[model samples]
Target: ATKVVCVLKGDGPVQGIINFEQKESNGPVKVWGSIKGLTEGLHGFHVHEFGDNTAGCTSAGPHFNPLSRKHGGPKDEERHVGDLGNVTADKDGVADVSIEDSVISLSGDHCIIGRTLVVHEKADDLGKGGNEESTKTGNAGSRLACGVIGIAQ
Candidate 1:
């Protein structure tokens, strides 16, 4: 119950490729993928923390919340854990959205396998920035593309 292969870049023309899928389901973790190269409009995807796509994706640093906590909407109990949000691009940018999250995993020991899959250039005020902790997704800037979630061949 683990699979990873999300490759999308070049901004504003993506389709869909979201993942979680930790052994199919006990609640949270079991997402699917596809995302082709977005830019018809909105774009802000998650699960990031180094997969080193060679900085083409800003070194995949932010997201994958190790408990920095902050970022809203998604049952906002204080977000981050790569707060999965925003994925809209259609007009020529393509669009395909699929999701499943109860806390996302891809293996038994609660796994996201060195998580990574960033893509943002705007939108993520989840961290309201009101002296910090609007949900902590406030660093929502830069990093246009990135991908890494190994163990799939």
Candidate 2:
């Protein structure tokens, strides 16, 4: 399996690191990550377009929707490749995320390497917000932190 890592960063008092592992070209990726400095609740998690670190989190651009698909939950047939859904934070303000999804990959057109991993300030409605922002960003709200994906080695 191949492994990748992303280090979360924020101008505020938030930070963490994430890791990814995939078995093959078309296999589901096994992910592992932990974040800190968040309120006790759900937070949106996704891969953004660019790895650009200039101009803050917005520099990462929009979600990594290569197919121009609509926003949706991880189980939705229609969804962006970058849509990893939400991660919940516990009392101590720590979020441990572990996901295995075929929609996320390390090879082919959907490759997430060099892209940006972001954690939003609000929960992702998973396209259930029933509004404009729902179809766009799951109404995930502002980015709290982000990091560029890179080879673990």
Candidate 3:
């Protein structure tokens, strides 16, 4: 079994922790976390290619696109390895997350360990916006908060 955690931080009031646990290498990863300080709505959540944040989220680089695919929703067959889709924040600015993903792993070429979990300020269009940026970024807005994933026992 493998488990990892990321402590989210931001310039605003955002704060949270996201945890990923995998029972089997080939099985889906179980994601559970809670984020606070967001407006009432959906926000894009993703894993960036690099863990670097010395220069802020901009230094984290693009989404982990090892597959060279377009930006899309979690249900899409063709999309970046980091595309776990959106997290909905309630009226009180809290998002309690629970997701099961088969693509994100703790090992292999697509392993996301040491990378970054970036929370965006706007809802993702899921690549259906029919524009160039949409296909690349899902039209997800500015990075709100981020954290580097760390291994855990």
Candidate 4:
């Protein structure tokens, strides 16, 4: 298993760690971790394309939607692979994000374990037809801040 820890450089901890575990049980890669020190509110979090980190957060590029499918709600049957939905901020402005899905891969074809984490200013609209087609933002406002997950030292 590979441990990817991202040094959250933002207003808070906003850090994360992705543990890529390959099980012999013949299942999807085990991707587990937590994002701490986040602001109290709604933040759009997703796995971007690049890891250069030069574009600041945007450097990661758009979500890892290799399928090139439309952007919609996380649960949307016809949504892009990059659409990880939204991460909610608690009263303390902290969100504990966790997800274990076969759809979220680490290698093979659809891998997103070592990717970057982007925090948006507003919420994603999920391209509900009201907004623009292939709506890049899901309506989720601006790019408030961002950070990449990495291994723990």
Per-prediction TM-score = 0.30, 0.97, 0.97, 0.75
Query: Could you give candidate 2's per-residue lDDT for residues 1-153 as a string of tens digits?
Result: 389999999987678889999978789999988999999999999999999989889999999999999999889999999999999999999998898889979998999999999999999999999798999899999999999999987
Candidate 2, pairs of clashing residues: none
TM match of model 4 to true structure: 0.75
When superposed on Cα atoms, how far off is each prediction in RMSD? 12.9, 1.0, 0.9, 3.2
Off by over 4 Å in 1: 12-45, 48-77, 84-103, 107-116, 121-128, 131-136, 146-151
lDDT of 4 by residue, 92-138 (tens): 76666665555555555665655776666656667774866336658
Quote model 1's TM-score: 0.30
**Per-model lDDT:** 0.61, 0.92, 0.91, 0.62
Give the per-residue lDDT of model 3 (tens digit) for 44-135: 99999999989888888999999899999889998899998999999999999999999888878779999999999999899999899889
Name the regions of candidate 2 deviating beyond 4 angstroms.
none
lDDT at 101, model 3: 94
Better of 3 and 4 by TM-score: 3
Q: How many backbone clashes does candidate 4 have?
A: 17
Q: How many residue pairs clash in each candidate?
A: 23, 0, 0, 17
